[PDB]
Design a protein around this ligand. Structure first.
Ligand SMILES: CN(C)c1ccccc1CNc1ccc(C(N)=O)cn1
Ligand SMILES: CN(C)c1ccccc1CNc1ccc(C(N)=O)cn1
Lengths: 238, 238
């Protein structure tokens, strides 16, 4: 339907089984809502030892991905994608991912995700082959595969059929009714649908204010949200 | 040595093969620098259908993780860890991970990572069993397993033997010397070690200023960094 195709360039394509074989994303793949197709630069080498790294000009302790096998793998993925695939490189230098960015990326029917290893890739391939650079957060990983899988999982939630507002989630409770002396809030047992809705929203506002108050500055709260937030801050200050 | 033990509670422990079987983290596991041990709540069920989810009090469309199998799995992991393991729950409601937070977390010799599925876990288990909540970024995933693997990979880079300053990385170049008409900066072929160091630092300052200027506000630049940043901004404005 609104299915999504994701090409992946990675030296460790088997890592992607973590999303393609399990849970909600594994079901999306099995039901053809999400297709994930991997190309490995190692298969595009020609020397006897299948070399995929190379030395940086200028010296330094690290290696980079070797240009030729990576470029050839990218070209093959682009040819398989046909027209209109956006090519994304995952790196700490990229645009910081957030939920608005996920929903932007989810608009593409095709994406190609390039997973860097070693110290990364040659800057000229970014210029010539990459459309957008994205980061999953301000921290350093050993390769771009976990960022690519994170991005796939986040976008997959927007594909119609895969599943069944700016604020943090409210607390949730399940059985039993008392757990190490802690009881479930009585409103949640009241059956009063509207009191339950307002309690949950007031809790989300309170938790957002206490934990991540900067997230509130970016929202235009509704009148109801403004009132419940005021109530929660009054209670907090009592 | 400074090895690290990470207990994981997950309904999909096989996802963790993505970090334990491949690349730098797979080597860390093989060489006993990193141990990752998984417990699955499904193995702590007692009904015929091995039920691991439960309905939220108050209604709503989602399910939560069932308390009893999850609590029992957590208790088993804590007993295996012995004393001093910090128990972390991965969620969007948690403290936002960044590199300073990774280095804080890397100080622990033992961690237990609880991976939520469905709409998450009962709030009272957070109160009774979880030490810290952490988020990998402001976006929603289908479970906490990719956040846990991201955290493991980021912390593993701090374990002595696993591998071979606030700014984004400089561009890097490898063979060939000309690539679709784009040449390598001559300084990197100069062999002048000190000119190369300064060029790389000036590029990191320039890229940080242009892409993520808020990161600069949190740094106390050195005199040399202040001078190279000034030079880069002068060049940019020429
Ligand atoms: C080895 N490095 C630093 C590297 C350098 C450049 C590109 C890819 C990599 C692979 N590592 C990544 C990738 C993404 C993220 C992120 N925060 O999105 C963190 N680490
Ligand atoms: C299903 N949800 C929303 C959920 C709710 C609460 C806990 C765990 C989960 C599992 N999903 C996660 C986990 C972490 C992150 C993150 N940004 O660190 C994103 N999603």
């Amino acid at each position: 339907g609104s299915h999504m195709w994701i090409g992946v360039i990675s030296l460790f394509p088997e890592m992607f089984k973590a999303i393609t074989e399990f849970g909600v994303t594994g079901r999306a793949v099995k039901h053809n809502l999400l297709k994930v197709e991997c190309w490995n630069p190692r298969d595009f080498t020609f020397d006897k030892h299948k070399t995929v790294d190379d030395r940086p000009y200028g010296g330094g302790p690290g290696m980079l991905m070797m240009v030729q096998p990576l470029r050839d793998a990218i070209h093959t993925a682009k040819a398989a994608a046909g027209e209109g695939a956006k090519v994304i490189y995952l790196s700490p230098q990229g645009r910081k991912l957030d939920q608005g960015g996920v929903t932007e990326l989810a608009q593409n029917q095709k994406l190609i995700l390039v997973c860097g290893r070693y110290e990364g890739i040659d800057e000229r391939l970014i210029q010539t082959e990459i459309d957008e650079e994205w980061s999953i957060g301000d921290y350093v990983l050993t390769g771009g595969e976990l960022p690519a899988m994170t991005l796939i999982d986040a976008v997959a939630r927007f594909i119609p059929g895969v599943l069944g507002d700016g604020l943090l989630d409210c607390p949730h409770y399940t059985r039993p009714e008392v757990l190490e002396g802690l009881t479930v809030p009585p409103v949640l047992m009241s059956g009063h649908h509207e009191e339950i809705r307002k309690w949950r929203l007031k809790q989300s506002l309170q938790r957002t204010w206490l934990r991540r108050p900067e997230l509130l500055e970016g929202l235009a709260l509704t009148d109801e949200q403004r009132k419940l937030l005021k109530e929660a801050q009054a209670e907090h200050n009592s």
